[PDB]
Design a protein around this nucleic acid. Structure first.
Ligand SMILES: [Mg+2]
Ligand SMILES: [Mg+2]
Ligand SMILES: [Mg+2]
Ligand SMILES: [Mg+2]
Ligand SMILES: [Mg+2]
Ligand SMILES: [Mg+2]
Ligand SMILES: [Mg+2]
Ligand SMILES: [Mg+2]
Ligand SMILES: [Mg+2]
Ligand SMILES: [Mg+2]
Ligand SMILES: [Mg+2]
Ligand SMILES: [Mg+2]
Ligand SMILES: [Mg+2]
Ligand SMILES: [Mg+2]
Ligand SMILES: [Mg+2]
Ligand SMILES: [Mg+2]
Ligand SMILES: [Mg+2]
Ligand SMILES: [Mg+2]
Ligand SMILES: [Mg+2]
Ligand SMILES: [Mg+2]
Lengths: 82, 177, 67, 95, 116
RNA sequence: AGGGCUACACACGUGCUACAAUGGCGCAUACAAAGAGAAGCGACCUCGCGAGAGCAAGCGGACCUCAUAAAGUGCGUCGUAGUCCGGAUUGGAGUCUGCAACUCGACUCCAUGAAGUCGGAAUCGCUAGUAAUCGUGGAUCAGAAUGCCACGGUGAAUACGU
RNA sequence: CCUCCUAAAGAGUAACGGAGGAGCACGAAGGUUGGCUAAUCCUGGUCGGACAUCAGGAGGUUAGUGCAAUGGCAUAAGCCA
């Protein structure tokens, strides 16, 4: 994973638009393609609908989801079986 | 007698106060301990059952009875009268003695402990309890073992209500969770 | 108690780690050296915790130290 | 007899698969010791073609046939392998 | 020869024997037998009760057996309940670390399930 | 921009590593060839268990750097065990490349320690510095070889015959 | 040949009337003395499961009787020495 010295990576666009969520309290879900970005503590409490390739899917963030990277909650292949 | 002694002055007098038993006779006492170990695998080979017997005799200090099926059942393909397990009733000097041992040697050798349950009671106040392995008792010698084997251990009491028992046990610093 | 059917049942000595020593009757037929008596045991003594859950946010602020 | 189907410019449906399997099941009566075998179907412009290759107990037998359909192609092919398989057998059971 | 409430081989070099403890590998084995200044080539059978205890002490420094097995199992339960990609790999019983499945992958998947 | 080519009831082909004692592990110690490097090859010194980090000599190179060959050899240990054999799998903790390693990188440490006891029918390579076996380099390339193309070390077996 | 019903509350009582058994078994499964009490459900308990063996409770013969059915059977005719 990313070196520890370089700090935790988040795309700025998404970093910004979870100040307005946390300061100017809203309660909407946010669209995002930012599967790179790790989940910061600020993100706890806010649903955020991350892209999986064709659709955005909601991730109601929690304490347990911290450090992981959004896209780690939007599966990108469909498989039922054979 | 250690705990018979401990029982006869320390335990009786505590429980005496905390329930307000006017008569002393009212205080729960422990009646008897009994160690079952069924051995279905007997119908296969009968040597196994006797091999248990020595274990239970080695633990407990007295020869076990050998129990037999009350009725025939086709479920387990047994027929009324085949030996399929063996017990020992313990009642006095020996009962208090084994108890002492159980608490202060055996039970803190349970492969990864978290005490015992305090839920296992029949509703009148008689504590039942299993043991997964029989290396727990140092009476046996682990490099002379044929199989891992278990037993039940049931402490029959003169306690009236489920609750009143638990107290009697605890008052011997019984390791409940 | 019946005669000459039961195993020998006698005094021994059972020396724990923590120096704790207890004369006891048993078949085993010689003195034991045991390693965890009812005094030497996490559970009886009051030690064992229950595994620290809920570290993710503490972790993350300990790990990176970023504004 | 383990089978394998290809399609070079042909979609193997579940007639053309089912059909080809049944037709090939005969061949074992000509020689009991057939192993894995590969089949290939082609369409080039107007020509329907079908070749197979058959790993057998001490050999490799191949033929290809051209039909105006693929069924008629495969019909032709099975007649070609039959003759080769018999020839093989007979120069082993040679007493 | 009872450590961490399990029996240790008593005819094995301490180094080798101590490995039977779940949660100690070989690095730890070496450490233990120096942190508790006990030689490596010594077999467990030829020790003193005293030696075996100072040894018993070292091992307690780590998290081992029961304890460990619990920790692991929490970590995996944690993942599956999170439902992360890594979680489901654990559910469906599939290579969790990116390995191909089109072929091979038989250690997760187990032996073959034929068709029909 | 994000995803996909990396999907997995399964079938086939080409490889790698094994199943051990002509061997595993620890210490000690010999003998190559060929090739690459410019904003690239990067010593020595300091830090770190380690991947690495910091600082910064030399070299457009029979001069400097990659870069200490390995099998071998001596001394010790293991004593035929699913083992001190094997190292798949998985948890935890890291490093580096790169806007960025969730899907999907290579590597490191701690723990874990699977199948496998030499492989049915079939079937392949090779006639001498060959097969077998052991290490080394390069092209592509920010990073990403068990593949490919090259280079030496040790070094057999057997051909009556048609 | 045995048991029940038809059979009309003593006995007996027919039909190619309605339903079932026997053509044995036991030297103990006989004699006596001493002792003993069932089925089944619930609660708790290593493997152990609806059902094995252990402990308690409810229950009261709903069990049991070498083999049919009927009548018996606790003082047991049931179970063990
Ligand atoms: Mg035809
Ligand atoms: Mg390791
Ligand atoms: Mg694109
Ligand atoms: Mg591809
Ligand atoms: Mg190989
Ligand atoms: Mg190894
Ligand atoms: Mg290069
Ligand atoms: Mg250093
Ligand atoms: Mg030639
Ligand atoms: Mg090589
Ligand atoms: Mg009458
Ligand atoms: Mg009348
Ligand atoms: Mg008449
Ligand atoms: Mg009549
Ligand atoms: Mg009789
Ligand atoms: Mg009588
Ligand atoms: Mg039960
Ligand atoms: Mg009862
Ligand atoms: Mg009845
Ligand atoms: Mg009688």
């Amino acid at each position: 994973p990313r070196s520890l010295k370089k700090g935790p990576f988040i795309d700025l666009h998404l970093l910004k638009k979870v100040e307005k969520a946390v300061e100017s309290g809203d309660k909407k879900p946010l669209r995002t393609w930012s599967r790179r970005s790790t989940i910061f503590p600020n993100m706890i409490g806010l649903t955020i609908a991350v892209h999986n390739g064709r659709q955005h899917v909601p991730v109601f963030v929690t304490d347990e989801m911290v450090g992981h990277k959004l896209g780690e909650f939007a599966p990108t292949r469909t498989y039922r079986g054979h | 007698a250690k705990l018979h002694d401990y029982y006869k002055d320390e335990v009786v007098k505590k429980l005496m106060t905390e329930f307000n038993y006017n008569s002393v006779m009212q205080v729960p006492r422990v009646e008897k301990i009994t160690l079952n170990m069924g051995v279905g695998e007997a119908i296969a080979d009968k040597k196994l059952l006797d091999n248990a017997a020595a274990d239970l005799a080695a633990i407990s200090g007295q020869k076990p009875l050998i129990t037999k099926a009350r009725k025939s059942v086709a479920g387990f393909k047994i027929r009324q009268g085949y030996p399929i397990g063996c017990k020992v009733t313990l009642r006095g000097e020996r009962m208090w003695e084994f108890f002492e041992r159980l608490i202060t040697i055996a039970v803190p050798r349970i492969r990864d402990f978290r005490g015992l349950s305090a839920k296992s009671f029949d509703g009148r106040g008689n504590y039942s309890m299993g043991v997964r392995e029989q290396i727990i008792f140092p009476e046996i010698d682990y490099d002379k073992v044929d199989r891992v084997r278990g037993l039940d251990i049931t402490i029959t009491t003169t306690a009236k209500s489920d609750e009143e028992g638990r107290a009697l046990l605890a008052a011997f610093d019984f390791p409940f969770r | 108690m019946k005669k000459d059917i039961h195993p020998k049942y006698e005094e021994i000595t059972a020396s724990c780690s923590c120096g704790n020593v207890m004369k006891i009757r048993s078949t085993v037929g010689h003195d034991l050296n045991l390693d965890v008596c009812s005094k030497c045991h996490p559970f009886f003594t009051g030690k064992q915790r229950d595994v620290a859950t809920g570290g993710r946010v503490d972790r993350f602020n300990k790990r990176f130290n970023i504004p | 007899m383990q089978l394998n189907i290809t399609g070079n410019n042909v979609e193997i449906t579940e007639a053309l698969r089912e059909f080809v399997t049944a037709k090939f099941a005969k061949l074992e009566q000509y020689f009991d010791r057939i192993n894995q075998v590969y089949v290939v179907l082609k369409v080039e412009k107007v020509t329907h073609t079908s070749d197979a290759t058959l790993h057998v107990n001490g050999g490799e037998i191949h033929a290809s046939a051209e039909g105006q359909d693929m069924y008629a192609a495969i019909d032709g092919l099975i007649d070609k392998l039959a003759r080769q398989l018999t020839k093989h057998k007979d120069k082993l059971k040679q007493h | 020869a009872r450590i961490a409430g399990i029996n240790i081989p008593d005819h094995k070099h301490a180094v080798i024997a101590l490995t039977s403890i779940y949660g100690v590998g070989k690095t730890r084995s070496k450490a233990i037998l120096a942190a508790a200044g006990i030689a490596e080539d010594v077999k467990i059978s030829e020790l003193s009760e005293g030696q075996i205890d100072t040894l018993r002490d070292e091992v307690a420094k780590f998290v081992v057996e029961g304890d460990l097995r619990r920790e692991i199992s929490m970590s995996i339960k944690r993942l599956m309940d999170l439902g992360c990609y890594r979680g489901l790999r654990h559910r469906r019983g599939l290579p969790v670390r990116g390995q191909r499945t089109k072929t091979n992958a038989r250690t997760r998947k187990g032996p073959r399930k034929p068709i029909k």
